[PDB]
Paper text:
RECQL5 is a regulator of transcription elongation known to interact directly with Pol II, thereby playing important roles in suppressing genome instability. In this study, we solved several cryo-EM structures of Pol II ECs complexed with RECQL5 in different nucleotide-binding states of the helicase. The RECQL5 IRI module, encompassing the αN helix and KIX domain, wraps around the surface of the RPB1 lower jaw with exquisite molecular complementarity, serving as an anchor point of RECQL5 on Pol II. Meanwhile, the helicase domain binds to the RPB1 upper jaw and downstream DNA.
Our cryo-EM processing showed the coexistence of both free and RECQL5-bound ECs in our sample. By selecting particles without RECQL5, we were able to solve the structure of a free EC containing only Pol II and the nucleic acid scaffold at 2.6 Å overall resolution (ECFree). The good local resolution (2.3–3.1 Å) attained for the Pol II core region allowed us to assign unambiguously the DNA/RNA register. In ECFree, the tDNA i site base G14 is positioned a distance of 8.7 Å from the RPB1 bridge helix (Cα of RPB1 T854 taken as a reference point). Moreover, when superimposed on the bridge helix, ECFree showed great similarity to the Pol II–α-amanitin structure (RMSD = 0.5 Å). These observations indicate that in the absence of RECQL5, Pol II adopts an intermediate conformation between the pre- and post-translocation states. Moreover, while we did not observe density in ECFree corresponding to the single-stranded ntDNA (indicating it is not stably tethered to Pol II), in ECREC-Apo this region is stabilized through contacts with the RECQL5 helicase and RQC domains.
Numbering used by the authors:
A (entry chain B): 148 to 196
B (entry chain A): 355 to 910
C (entry chain F): 46 to 127
D (entry chain K): 1 to 115
E (entry chain J): 1 to 67
F (entry chain B): 442 to 539
G (entry chain C): 2 to 132, 146 to 271
H (entry chain B): 588 to 874, 888 to 1174
The structure:
RNA sequence: AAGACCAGGC
DNA sequence: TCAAGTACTTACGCCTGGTCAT
């Protein structure tokens, strides 16, 4: 173990990858939420190009 | 040199045509928070005792009591009866009430008319409300704009604001010896529509309009038409708004240039021009040239002849009576004002096609080396000059054609001839042609290799490739025209966002250069070191507020 | 300077008017005797205004010239614009 | 936070008189009526009724501020005819018209239903 | 969110017409015909159902706080 | 902590070198509206200074056609500098040129 | 200086709409009658809501606002009821209010539509216009909604919940003879439902001697009051306002003189 | 190109640029290059055939997608410097056809020219009929419009969350809003808008709203505020505990009411909380207890919606309390259409007071006609016309930018088929008097947005409250009960007024007033013991000649800072 | 003090100075079980 | 700054425009004195600036007070 | 408040001589200790010197009636081991 | 407790 | 004396809020 890399939501290594809308609602996640942001200490951070 | 202050309020501003020029609408919460300390006298001891009894809870109440010792009795928290005793010399900090003098500001404060003293009028809801003629001095509009409320805390500063900074006292600026306030927006448009010959009013309509005239003597004037039915004219009612006996001559926007030379000079076939004799609107249709903020306007003459107090009533009465008449006539904007005739559209298309053919001919001359360079210009420079000349002439011709097609009922033309909002170029772009889009004063640059967009071939100097929008806003822009229009408007957005800092820096530099320069008691203008900047202010010793434009009549 | 040879405007300036009005209003609010007969006037600012119209404010305006000299003008000696 | 209560447009609070009669000193036989908690529904109808009176020289109404709830009706009449008398006559006129209209509307409803 | 009662402009009851509108759309009717079948004549009433988005159905996909 | 700090504060670099570190990266995601969230998730930044009065980098270049929205630009000190992606715009993820 | 004698001709009379024409009256009188249709016609509506349980996806004030907009049949007991301000009782009493009870819980997997039919009134006559059903909220399994509501007597001036009518159609001078509106192009304006001119002509010739009369009405009830009762209540309320103003004016005249 | 089209050796990301004049072929595989798909034109024909479209129509249960289209060599990703060498056709059926020849060597075609717009600019109906600054303003404003920002907003404990009561999808929509998910999560209501001058309260940019419509739920919204609090163990014995404080157990205490807290010091949801009420009760053990409770933001007046208890990373007690407040649109709230026409609510009129059509229609919003001519948002007018057509027809209007099949005349002809004037004008009656308005008013359903900017969140008033620790001047910020800044420009303006006393009040009296005792010999401040009356100047042995000087506290701070830099700013009263 | 779990939605009673952990599920996010005291809502 | 700070004005007037600490260091090194005749200088020390309503002085006339009412 | 109220008619600038700084300074011998507190109370000769001003906002200055508002603060000094150039005066 | 940054408003 | 370097500074008004780490 060398560290923890913050995971972008709905990415390949996110837990919401490949989940159906029913599965997403089961986790209280919006199916229309595009993801693409990180959660750091609860706050949602988006990296600007 | 600047700091945060107590007794200050900020909230969004919303219009109120029913307030006076010097009045400001203030929400109850703000007035219940802001307090003015008033020294108790045997004249006001009972009123201030009642205010103390009401306390901080009831709005027309008080928050603190200041004794002669300087100790402050708080009235916000269940005070003890003995501490509510008011003997002469105490200062009770009463809540701000109607008629209180406040300083009203909208940052940035560019000139001294951007921070004027108003008169408090308590109104429901939570916004500051100011009359629409006071919008121009503050450069304000009611889309999320916020203004500051500074409440003077002493009788001396209250009198200072009342005698110096009151809105009616700031009507005419010394900057340009012109009014800063004028009749604007709906009131201006409805004045223009109300001052035409065709406006005949019924008896009840005249009575309702007169109910909104504060300076009315109570005598209903005899109508212009007595038989077969009584009918008052719009000019007849407006003449009752004009203060005193004002003598003024102006011209309407649509005034032809042949009327003064030929006959009907004093009859005005189009009812244009403007004549106000003895405070009576004898003839003419009013617009921004008569009620606007310009030299020699009717409001300017009202200030220069009657004074600030009666000019304030002039403004407010115009606003109220004209809005209430517009309640009958109404004003709108729709698609029908953006639509021209079929013949006008064909004429515009013929003009645009001719312009494009002319540009093609110029391009062919340039490609064949037949373009002789104008002296002082290169071949590319003279080619661009010719192309811009052709395109500008085309857009002017199309704009004239679109303007001539507008009926007297057209609302674009209605707001343009009144001066309330818009110009002939807006009508031309909406109806006829948007026009050439320029970046840095030149046609749309070749961002790509020798082409403006990938959709054009290289070395395409025609109007379409370089940013000439053949379509109008009503017609809608093509994708290339859409992108070129976006590029053109981006420059204006950049200029707007970048001008503020440099202009503010220049203004600060000027103010630091001349902050201590003042007119001394021997009429000499001196700095802080008593060095004579000017022997007489303006070399004539006059203030810039009272001077007017005049002609020598002996020169030339 | 003395009363004679006063070289200044006989008119009361707007700044002088404002400050005299505020000062007199403050004095009235602090129980100063009113020089004019008031008819149901309880606002010290308005009483100061009506004293100004009556040329009754007991204030001398000291106008400092840039050379350090001064001229004392009574409010009644100055002609009010209003 | 400064929202006035919704009943503040028709309810009279303590000490607020419904109608106040004040003479107008500019013109003879002219009066000003201040109606509290009233709006265009009564003001316009009273102004229109007063204009039907040949002895009413002037009849107008206005709301000084829409955010406030008050009506000012200015009535001027001929000599030897008080504006208060004209106001009372106009109100009685309106009540008589409304009663006749209600009776005729009820008769029309009865005629339309099974008739 | 949910079909509003009392159409904003005029005040006609449109809260009882959402399910009927959905059924009429589902079986035969076009939207214009379905609005006429429900008696929604004024376009103020028509835009209430025509422009309505029923987010409450998506909100019912979430489990309640208490079982 | 390096990843968490740089994503949290937005100062892209070492915490001790925050001044030499570029700031403004990793904004807090805007949840005011869904359109706002989409705009924040598709947004480009020009690293040049906002206080700069140079108007050329703020201008809408012809090459932004189909790549950057010609209309969505932060009105204010970031005009032309903060830009947003077009709907069809895609950004290359990289490949080995072997 | 006396009252005009108005006449009424009723053309359409349904359970939802009353279309009638009033002749020989002022425009101000007609417009005031129209305003009272919306503003000053008393009607019973829910104004006091207390919620015991609300597990639905809509918060408490959402469902309270939806409940207040539900019309209730107030045909006859609205006149018997007294305003809660004028009532001697504290809080609410049957002489000033009608109590409502709602208790819905979704136990089945199928969605539960909470409708106005689930509103239960203590009075057999005040019913939420259910002799479809107005949707209050949709309940997933495990979601519950229990509340108590009191229905007060009010008019549309206080709140739009007490507006007894849908869109009140009002019209005078169908063919433009008084020229109260001027058409820049009269030929492109659709002819009114009450137009009496031929297809060839667009507007009637100008009538200088004419005045607004023969006002065309179409009052559409929302079900709280019968559409014919709306006009009766409006006339009675306008007359009541005039009578109260007359009483106070007479008192003022006697006091000041 | 053949390899990239077939995806054999060159992936679609790779860009290949041939500079013919400079004899250079540049191939780029690196990341960061911005590219967009374009159809491929071979000869003068599109490679996109009818079979591709037929296969895509059956995209479900066919395993045919965009990747199949790219792998078939029909579409191609082209970046900017390769777009330099491309010859693009805007539309196929217009630019590849044989006509008066302009270009015959087209190599690519636009999929659709509306794809140049981003997310926020794609919600604009008829953007090509608007002035570009208005499109930019609407693009900025759309991120500020309120709707249902996310479907799981119930589980989200987000600070400053706004949700709309009745979001509606636009009656006039763009073909891109389907891909923007705007129909699912819309921010705005189709409002019957009359562009009219009614009573002057819509003048400038302000709007007049229907009070009756607002009562019926028109543009009602909810504001959610989440408060976070955390127990902690910092000192050896210092700790934080969530509990309901008693009257005398905590050293610090506020005049607020703690009776709403539970045994855990947390208010239960459903409890109506006004300003100054305590949200979370926390105590600090002082090395008895010190109050660290959290209170509401001033004048919120909401109701607790949800309270969450958990453990944070450190395992300590962590609480998030969400307070909901319903915000009825007042006369200070900000509204805008999708065309940059922003404005506040000038006033609200009820249904009887609003102008009404012959059918009883009263506009929900009245906007001034003066906002249109200079700002030239013709797309607003066309949107209103198309919305009027679509509401009566029953369809949703198509306002995709460059259509060439949706003209204003066609919309007018469609409107004329439903008994309305083709230009959208309608005869209105004055609500107050019942009289016809002489000018016919342009009325139709226009999609409007309620912006985050509300008057209650922006209204502030200061009267002698908190001051800064260092400057002793009024605090900064509405949240900190701060005072407005009387800046240098305001000072210059008051100098121009010649208002020396008001200037002194603002810069000396209203802000920090202060007194110091300076020596008379030197100008340096002296030790002044007022109670003992022993005034001494260390440095002159001056106990007799010491003067009292009234100066702003910031000036004393400046002089002390100058003395800290060895400067002697000697204030001389002689 | 009854808390509602956010995962299994069961009611558990915990006191002060007790770690948040739902029985039979082991979930550390709970909710406050809306109060019994009734608040009047104006149907406006 | 080059031109406004070169005028023979007080160091406090200059320190209000674009140099501040440098101007005050120069004044301290050379013993410059500020005559307090400007507007910025008086504003900094919270004194009535010699602007309008501050450029003159008010005196009480005792003779004119000998006409007062409620004394 | 027994001292007469005066207006500043002139501000004389100059450099604080070390002798004047030492005479003016309220700490005797200078600030020798960099610690603010050593036993929970402010140490004399440290950065937080009660002779230098008011602490805790409810206490009183050691040199005057402080009240945390009436106390204008008093100057201390540090006697440098060796002379050090003044950055502001280095060019001069 | 007040700094840094960020976003926004006019 | 000069004049060409090189170091060295200096441009946003007001307002909101949020978050983060000392
Ligand atoms: Zn409707
Ligand atoms: Zn009762
Ligand atoms: Zn000394
Ligand atoms: Zn659990
Ligand atoms: Zn001390």
């Amino acid at each position: 173990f060398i560290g923890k890399i913050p995971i972008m939501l709905r990415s390949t290594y996110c837990l919401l990858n490949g989940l159906t809308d029913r599965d997403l609602c089961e986790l209280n996640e919006c199916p229309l939420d595009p993801g693409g942001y990180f959660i750091i200490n609860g706050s949602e951070k988006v990296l600007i190009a | 040199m600047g700091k945060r202050v107590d007794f200050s309020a900020r909230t969004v501003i919303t219009p109120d045509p029913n307030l006076s020029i010097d009045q400001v609408g203030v929400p109850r919460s703000i007035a219940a928070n802001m307090t003015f300390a008033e020294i108790v006298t045997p004249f006001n001891i009972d009123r201030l005792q009642e205010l103390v009894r009401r306390g901080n809870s009831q709005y027309p109440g008080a928050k603190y009591i200041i004794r002669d010792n300087g100790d402050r009795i708080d009235l916000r928290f269940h005070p003890k009866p003995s501490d509510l005793h008011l003997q002469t010399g105490y200062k009770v900090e009463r809540h701000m009430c109607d008629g209180d003098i406040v300083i009203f500001n909208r940052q940035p404060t560019l000139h001294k008319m951007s921070m004027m003293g108003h008169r408090v009028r308590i109104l429901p809801w939570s916004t500051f409300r100011l009359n629409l003629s006071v919008t121009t001095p503050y450069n304000a509009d009611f889309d999320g704009d916020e203004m500051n409320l500074h409440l003077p805390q002493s009788l001396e500063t209250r009198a200072e604001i009342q005698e110096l900074a009151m809105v009616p006292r700031m009507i005419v600026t010394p900057q340009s010896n012109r009014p800063v306030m004028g009749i604007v927006q709906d009131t201006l448009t409805a004045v223009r529509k109300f001052t035409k010959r065709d406006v005949f009013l019924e008896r009840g309509e005249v009575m309702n309009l007169l109910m909104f005239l504060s300076t009315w003597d109570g005598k209903v004037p005899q109508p212009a038409i007595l038989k077969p039915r009584p009918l008052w004219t719009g000019k007849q009612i407006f003449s009752l708004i004009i203060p005193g006996h004002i003598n003024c001559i102006r011209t309407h926007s649509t005034h032809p240039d042949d009327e003064d030379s030929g006959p009907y000079k004093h009859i005005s076939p189009g009812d244009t021009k403007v004549v106000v004799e003895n405070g009576e609107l004898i003839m003419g249709i009013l617009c921004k040239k008569s009620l606007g903020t310009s030299a020699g306007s009717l409001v300017h003459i009202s200030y220069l002849e009657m004074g600030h107090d009666i000019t304030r009533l002039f403004y407010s009465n115009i606003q109220t009576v004209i809005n209430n008449w517009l309640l009958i006539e109404g004003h709108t904007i729709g698609i029908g004002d953006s639509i021209a005739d079929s013949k006008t559209y064909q004429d515009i298309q013929n003009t645009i096609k001719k312009a494009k053919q002319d540009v093609i001919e110029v391009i062919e001359k340039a490609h064949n080396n037949e373009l002789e360079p104008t002296p002082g210009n290169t071949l590319r420079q003279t080619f661009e000059n010719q192309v811009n000349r052709i395109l500008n002439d085309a857009r002017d011709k199309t704009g004239s054609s679109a303007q001539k097609s507008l009926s007297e009922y057209n609302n674009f033309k209605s707001m343009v001839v009144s001066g309330a909002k818009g110009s002939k170029i807006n009508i031309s772009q909406v109806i006829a042609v948007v026009g050439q889009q320029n970046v840095e004063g030149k046609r749309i640059p070749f961002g790509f290799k020798h082409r403006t967009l990938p959709h054009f071939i290289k070395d395409d100097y025609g109007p379409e490739s370089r940013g000439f929008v053949e379509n109008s806003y009503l017609a809608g822009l093509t994708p290339t025209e859409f992108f070129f229009h976006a590029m053109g408007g981006r420059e204006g957005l950049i200029d707007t966002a970048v001008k503020t800092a440099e202009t503010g820096y220049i203004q600060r530099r000027l103010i630091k250069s001349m902050e201590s320069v003042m007119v001394k008691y021997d009429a000499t203008v001196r700095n802080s070191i008593n060095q004579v900047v000017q022997l007489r202010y303006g070399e004539d010793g006059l203030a810039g507020e009272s001077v007017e434009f005049q002609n020598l009549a002996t020169l030339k | 300077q003395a009363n004679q040879k006063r070289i200044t405007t006989p008119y009361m300036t707007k700044y002088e008017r404002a400050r005299v009005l505020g000062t007199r209003a403050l004095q009235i609010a602090m129980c100063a005797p009113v020089m004019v007969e008031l008819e149901g006037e309880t606002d010290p600012l308005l009483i100061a205004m009506k004293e100004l119209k009556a040329r009754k404010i007991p204030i001398i305006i000291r106008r400092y010239l840039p050379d350090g000299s001064y001229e004392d003008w009574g409010v009644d000696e100055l002609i009010i614009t209003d | 936070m400064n929202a006035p209560p919704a009943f503040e447009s028709f309810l009279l609070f303590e000490g607020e008189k419904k109608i106040t009669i004040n003479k107008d000193t500019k013109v003879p036989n002219a009066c000003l009526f201040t109606i509290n908690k009233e709006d265009h529904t009564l003001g316009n109808i009273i102004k229109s009724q007063l204009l039907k009176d040949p002895q009413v020289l002037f009849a107008g109404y206005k709301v000084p501020h829409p955010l406030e709830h008050k009506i000012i009706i200015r009535v001027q009449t001929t000599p030897d005819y008080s504006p208060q008398e004209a106001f009372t006559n106009a109100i009685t006129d309106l009540i008589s018209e409304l009663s006749l209209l209600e009776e005729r509307f009820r008769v029309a409803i009865k005629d339309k239903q099974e008739g | 969110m949910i079909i509003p009662v009392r159409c904003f402009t005029c005040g006609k009851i449109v809260g009882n017409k959402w399910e009927a509108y959905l059924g009429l759309l589902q079986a035969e009717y076009t939207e214009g015909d379905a609005l006429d079948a429900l008696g929604l004549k004024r376009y103020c009433c028509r835009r209430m159902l025509l422009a309505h988005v029923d987010l409450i159905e998506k909100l019912l996909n979430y489990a309640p706080l208490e079982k | 902590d390096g990843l968490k700090y740089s994503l949290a504060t937005g100062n892209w670099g070492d915490q001790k070198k925050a001044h030499q570190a570029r700031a403004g990266v990793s904004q807090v995601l805007n949840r005011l509206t869904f359109a706002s969230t989409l705009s924040h998730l598709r947004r480009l930044n020009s690293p040049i200074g906002r206080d700069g009065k140079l108007a050329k980098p703020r201008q809408l270049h012809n090459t932004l056609w189909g790549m950057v929205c010609p209309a969505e630009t932060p009105e204010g000190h970031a005009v032309g500098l903060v830009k947003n992606l077009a709907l069809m715009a895609y950004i290359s993820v990289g490949s080995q040129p072997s | 200086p006396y009252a005009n004698q108005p006449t009424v001709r009723i053309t359409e009379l349904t359970d939802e709409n009353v279309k009638f024409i009033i002749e020989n009256t002022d425009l101000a009188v007609a417009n005031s009658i129209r305003r009272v249709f919306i503003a000053e016609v008393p009607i019973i509506a829910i104004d006091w809501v207390q919620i015991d349980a609300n597990s639905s996806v809509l918060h408490d004030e959402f469902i309270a606002h939806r409940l207040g907009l539900i019309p209730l049949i107030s045909d006859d007991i609205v006149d018997k009821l007294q305003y809660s301000r004028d009532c001697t009782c504290e809080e609410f009493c049957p002489e000033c209010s009608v109590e409502f009870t709602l208790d819905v819980r979704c136990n089945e997997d199928q969605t539960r539509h909470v409708t106005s039919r689930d509103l239960i009134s203590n009075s057999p006559r005040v019913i939420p216009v259910t002799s479809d059903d107005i949707l209050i909220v949709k309940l997933r399994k495990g979601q519950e909604l229990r509340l108590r509501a009191y229905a007060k007597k009010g008019f549309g001036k206080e709140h739009a919940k007490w507006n007894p009518t849908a869109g009140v159609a009002f019209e005078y001078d169908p063919d433009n003879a008084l020229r109260h509106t001027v058409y820049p192009k009269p030929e492109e304006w659709p002819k009114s439902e009450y137009s009496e001119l031929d297809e060839d002509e667009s507007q009637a010739p100008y009538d200088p001697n004419g005045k607004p009369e023969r006002f065309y009405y179409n009052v559409e009830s929302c079900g709280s009051l019968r559409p014919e009762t709306i006009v009766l209540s409006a006339l009675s309320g306008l007359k009541k306002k005039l009578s109260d103003l007359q009483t106070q004016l007479s008192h003022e005249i006697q006091s000041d003189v | 190109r053949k390899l990239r089209r077939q995806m054999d050796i060159i992936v679609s990301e790779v860009s290949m640029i041939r500079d013919i004049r400079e004899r250079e072929i540049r191939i780029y595989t690196d990341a960061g290059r911005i590219c967009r798909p374009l159809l491929i034109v071979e000869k003068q024909k599109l490679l996109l055939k009818k079979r591709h479209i037929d296969q895509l129509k059956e995209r479900e249960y066919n395993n045919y997608s965009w990747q199949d289209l790219v792998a078939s060599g029909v579409v191609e990703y082209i970046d900017t410097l390769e777009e330099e060498t491309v010859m693009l056709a805007m539309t196929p059926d217009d630019l590849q056809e044989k006509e008066v020849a302009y270009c015959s060597t087209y190599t690519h075609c636009e999929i659709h020219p509306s794809m140049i717009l981003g997310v926020c600019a794609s919600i604009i109906p008829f953007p090509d009929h608007n002035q570009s600054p208005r499109n930019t303003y609407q693009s900025a404003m759309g991120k500020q419009a309120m709707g249902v920002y996310i479907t799981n907003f119930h589980v989200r404990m987000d600070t400053l969350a706004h949700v709309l009561y009745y979001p509606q999808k636009p009656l006039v929509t763009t073909r891109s809003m389907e891909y923007l998910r705007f129909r699912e999560l819309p921010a705005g209501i189709n409002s019957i808008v009359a562009i009219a001058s009614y009573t002057g309260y819509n003048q400038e940019d302000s709007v007049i709203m229907n009070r009756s419509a607002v009562d019926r739920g028109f543009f009602r919204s909810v504001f959610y505020r989440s408060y976070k609090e955390q127990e902690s163990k910092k000192g050896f014995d210092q700790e934080e505990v969530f509990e309901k404080p008693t009257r005398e157990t905590c050293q610090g205490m506020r005049h607020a009411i703690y009776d709403k807290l539970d045994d855990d010091g947390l208010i239960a949801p459903g409890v109506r909380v006004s300003g100054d009420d305590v949200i979370i009760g926390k105590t600090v053990t002082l090395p008895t207890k010190r109050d660290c409770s959290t209170f509401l933001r001033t004048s919120e007046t909401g109701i607790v919606d949800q309270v969450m208890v958990t453990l944070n990373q450190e395992g300590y007690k962590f609480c998030k309390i969400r307070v909901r407040s319903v915000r009825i649109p007042q006369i200070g709230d900000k509204f805008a259409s999708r065309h940059g026409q922003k404005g506040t609510c000038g006033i609200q009129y009820r249904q009887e007071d609003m102008p009404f059509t012959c059918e009883g229609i009263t506009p929900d919003i009245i906007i001034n006609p003066h906002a249109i001519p200079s700002r030239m948002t013709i797309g607003h007018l066309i949107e209103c016309l198309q919305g009027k057509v679509s509401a009566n027809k029953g369809e949703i209007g198509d306002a995709t930018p460059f259509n060439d099949a949706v003209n204003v005349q066609k919309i007018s002809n469609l409107l004329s088929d439903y008994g309305y004037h083709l230009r959208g004008n309608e005869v209105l009656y004055n609500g107050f008097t019942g009289r016809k308005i002489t000018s016919q008013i342009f009325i139709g359903p226009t999609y409007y947005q309620r912006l985050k900017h509300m008057v209650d969140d922006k209204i502030h008033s200061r009267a002698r409250g908190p001051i800064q620790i260092l400057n002793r001047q009024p605090m900064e910020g509405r949240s900190r009960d701060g005072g407005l800044r009387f800046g240098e420009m305001e000072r210059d303006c008051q100098i121009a007024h010649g208002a020396a006393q008001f200037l002194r009040e603002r810069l000396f009296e209203a802000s920090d007033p202060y007194q110091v005792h300076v020596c008379n010999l030197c100008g340096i401040m002296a030790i002044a013991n007022t109670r003992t009356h022993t005034y001494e100047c260390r440095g002159c042995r001056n106990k007799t000649q010491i003067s009292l000087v009234r100066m702003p506290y910031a000036c004393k701070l400046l002089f002390q800072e100058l003395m800290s830099m060895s400067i002697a700013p000697r204030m001389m009263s002689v | 003090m009854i808390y509602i779990c956010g995962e299994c939605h069961t009611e558990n009673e915990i006191k002060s100075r007790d770690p948040i952990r739902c029985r039979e599920c082991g979930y550390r996010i709970m909710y406050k079980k809306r109060t019994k005291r009734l608040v009047v809502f104006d149907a406006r | 700054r080059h031109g406004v700070n070169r005028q023979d004005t007080g160091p406090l007037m200059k320190c209000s425009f674009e140099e501040t600490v440098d101007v005050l260091m120069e004044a301290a090194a050379h013993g410059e004195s500020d005559p307090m005749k400007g507007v910025s200088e008086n504003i900094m020390l919270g004194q009535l600036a010699p602007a309008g309503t501050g450029c003159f002085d008010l005196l009480l006339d005792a003779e004119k007070c000998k006409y007062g009412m409620e004394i | 408040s027994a001292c007469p109220l005066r207006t500043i008619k002139r501000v004389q600038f100059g450099v604080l001589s070390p002798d004047e700084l030492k005479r003016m300074s309220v700490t005797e011998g200078g600030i020798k200790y960099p610690e603010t507190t050593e036993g929970g109370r402010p140490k004399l000769g440290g950065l937080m010197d009660p002779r230098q001003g008011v602490i805790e906002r409810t206490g009183r200055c050691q040199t005057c009636a402080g009240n945390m508002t009436e106390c204008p603060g008093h100057f201390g000094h540090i006697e440098l081991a060796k002379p050090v150039f003044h950055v502001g005066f280095l060019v001069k």
